[PDB]
Symmetry: C2
Subunit: 105 residues, 2 copies
Amino acid sequence: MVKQIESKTAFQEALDAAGDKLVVVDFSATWCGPCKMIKPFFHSLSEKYSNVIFLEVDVDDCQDVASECEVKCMPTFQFFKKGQKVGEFSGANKEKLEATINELV
Amino acid sequence: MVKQIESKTAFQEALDAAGDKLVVVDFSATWCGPCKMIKPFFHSLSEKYSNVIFLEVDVDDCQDVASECEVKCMPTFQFFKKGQKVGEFSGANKEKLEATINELV
């Protein structure tokens, strides 16, 4: 299911507890239309792939996590494995979200 | 100089009062590193080009202006002439900002 991140401490903790699993982070903003458009599909991916951790970071609540991860477009999806960023793209592209998850898992 | 926009009503009013002049709008966010990087150069362009109107819209204060203008990356510069959008690009590129202003003025 999708884990809502509300601090830098909760982000770090989640990337530590994921262990060996792929972590997909959706960086979004409430004002951004493409972000609202892809939110149901992002939550469907979390029920389909139980072996992948799905995080949501609202850039307005976690401005510090947003700056440190160098987010500049909404939505941006960053992919992490064992604390290292292994992929990233921006845009509400459903096919490419799922396709990148199947390459990295 | 740069006019800080704090409502949809002030945005509309500014695009009406510009008359015939080019209007350059910088859509920015406080958390976004490239936005901070280009802010002095954007304010220098406003002192150099007195025949062009320079607006700043913080997407966090004007979420409604941000959604309606379909902003998705920070910074985004939109260019208007007589209320019509005539150019747009995203990214903190100094050369391309000034170069687009000289094409459209």
